[PDB]
Symmetry: D3
Subunit: 127 residues, 6 copies
C-alpha cells in the first residue's frame, strides 16, 4: 500500500509543519524574544531553539537578559545588524524547515545561518 | 502546502487502486469472463477492458460468445495457452496498474501484454 | 533500481487515471445515468460507483428507475439540488481520484461528498 | 533544478523531525509531564501540545496540577488507563508526525487519538 | 530516516545532472563533434555517446572522419537535415536525461530519437 | 499529467545512472587510470572526473604520468593509502551519484571525499 502509506506520511508531516509554523513570532508560551535594531520584538520559544540550534540557544542563555513585558517576565536577547524580516525568516526555518527563502534576504539569512551554525541554511542561501 | 497537497493526492490514488483491485475476478457487475485451459473462469468487466485495452475488448467482442452461468447471461471468452495465474495478474494490471509482477509469470504476462498491445506491461516484463 | 522502478510505477498509474478519466460522462458501456435539475444527463458506470462509493450505488439501486434513451434501456437516477458541473466533478473524482477540485465548486462537492460518504473528498473541500 | 530543490526540502524536513524527536520524553525545558498508571512519568513541552493538540493542552490546563520534582516546579497531569509505551508513542507522533506506529499499540493509540481529537492518528490506527 | 535519505539521494542526483549538463557542447575533453547543415559545430564526448546510445556511437565510428580544428584533431561527423537547436537538445538529453523538451522541437527530436534508437525520447515526443 | 510526467522523469534519470554506472572501471574509452597500493588498476574517464571533481582532475593532470598498457597510452595516477574497493566506490559515486555506500568503507570514502573536495560525499559518510 505504498501510495496510501506515503500519502499518510506526507500529510502528517504537512500538518506538523503548519502547526509549528503557527508558533512563529507567536507570544503564546514564549519564553524568549529577540529585539532587532528597528526596535521590533520577535517572540520565540526556547523549545525550538534548543532542539534546532545549539549556538543560538547558547547565545540566548549567555547574552539574553530578564525583561518584563506587559507584566510578564521573559528572556530578551538583542539581535543586531539584521532586518526584522530576515530574523523572522530565520526563526521560520527553525520552526518549519521551509526551504522557500525570499531571495532578497539571502545575504542576511546566510549571515545569521553562519553565525549560529545552521549549515543547511547556508547551503540554501548559496544555491 | 506541498506536503499536505501531495499527501492528499497519493492517498486518494491509493484508495482508488485498492477499490478497483477489489473488483479483480469479482463476479459482481461482471459482464464478461475468461475461460482458461484449466477450466477456471475469471470474471471481468467490460468497463475496464474498453477503457484500458482496445485490443482485448475487440477480441472479447469478436471472439466472445453468450453463456448462461447460474441462470445469468454473460459474454464468455476463451483465453487459451495461459495459466490462470498469469491471466489473473494481467487483469490485475488493467484494473490497478500495479507494477509488482511475480517474476515467475513474466514470460506469460509478456506474451499476453504483446498479444493485446499493453506496451507498458511488455516493458515491465523485459526489465 | 529505485528511479527506474518508481518511474515505471508512476507512469503506469498515470496511464490508468487517464484511461478511466476518458470514461467520465462517457455513454459507452453506461448502465446508469444521473439527471440534474437543469435537465442535463450525466452518463456513468455502475462498476465505478459500486467499487468506489457504497452509498451512491445503494441510492442508484433504491431510487433509480428504468428509462429508455435512444432505444436503449438504462437506470436513470434523479440527482437534485446540484449543478451539473459539481455532479460531473464528483464523478470525475470517483473515476480518477483527481484532487484538483475547482474552488468554485467546493460547497456543492462537499455536500455531495457528505451525502454519499466520500470522507476523503469532504477533507479536500474543507482544506 | 527540481532534484536539487526537492532534495534540499526533504533533507531539511528530515533534520527537523529528528531534532524534535530528540525532545520526546526529554526533561530539558519540560514544563508539563504525564503520569501513567504504572507510576512512570513522561516529560513533555507545552509548546508542542498547544501547537499540535488543542484538546490535550486544554486537559493539561484544566486537570493538571503543580508538582515539585527534584526541586523544580512543573505541571503534572494524570493520564490513566494507558500503557506508558502507548502514551510515549502518542507524544512521539505529536512531536514528529511519524506514521510508523507499532501495531501492538494501535488500540491504545486510537483511544488516545480519539480522546484528544487527533483525527489523523485515528486513521493511521484503523488502517 | 526516509526524508534525510531520499533528500540526500535527490540532491546527489541533481548535482550529477547539473555537472554533466555543463559538458553539453563543451569543447573541453571533446573527442567528437557534429556538424549541422547550418555549419554550426556541436562539441560532444564519446564517453556519453557510447554509454547512452549505441546506434549513435556506431554512426560516429563508421561515418565520422578526422578533422583538425585550432590545431587539434577530433572526429567530425556530419549530422544533416536537423536544426542545430534540435541536435543540441538531443545531446542534452543524452547527457542529463532532462525530459523538459521544447515543444517546438518535438518533430525533429523524434526523428533523431528514432534514427538512433532512443526509445524513451520517442515516447517523450509523442506525449 | 503529474504522474505520467514524474514517471517519465524518474525513468529517464534511472536509465542515465545505469548507463554511466556501466562505465565504472570500464577500460573502453578510458584515458586515465588509478593504481592502488595493491597493484590493482581502476579504469576511469577524464570526462567524468573533470565534470564532477575539480580537485581530482587537477591531481590527475599534475601527478599523473604517461603509461603504456597493452600497447595503448594512458594517464596513470598513483592513488595510495586506500583500498581498491574504496577507490572503486568513490568512482562509482562520481559516475552515478549513488548514495548507497557500503558502511564498511565510510572511513576511507570520507578520506577520499575530503581529499578531493566532494562535500556531499563527506556528509553521506558522517551520516
Amino acid at each position: 500500500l505504498y501510495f496510501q502509506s506515503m500519502g499518510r506520511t506526507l500529510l502528517s508531516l504537512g500538518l506538523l509543519v503548519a502547526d509549528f509554523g503557527a508558533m512563529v513570532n507567536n507570544p503564546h508560551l514564549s519564553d524568549v524574544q529577540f529585539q532587532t535594531d528597528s526596535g521590533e520584538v520577535l517572540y520565540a520559544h526556547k523549545f525550538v531553539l534548543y532542539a534546532r540550534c545549539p549556538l543560538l540557544i547558547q547565545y540566548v542563555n549567555n547574552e539574553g537578559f530578564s525583561a518584563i513585558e506587559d507584566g510578564v517576565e521573559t528572556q530578551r536577547v538583542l539581535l543586531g545588524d539584521v532586518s526584522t524580516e530576515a530574523a523572522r525568516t530565520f526563526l521560520h526555518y527553525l520552526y518549519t524547515a521551509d526551504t522557500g527563502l525570499p531571495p532578497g534576504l539571502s545575504s542576511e539569512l546566510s549571515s545569521l545561518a553562519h553565525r549560529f551554525g545552521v549549515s543547511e541554511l547556508v547551503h540554501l542561501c548559496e544555491q
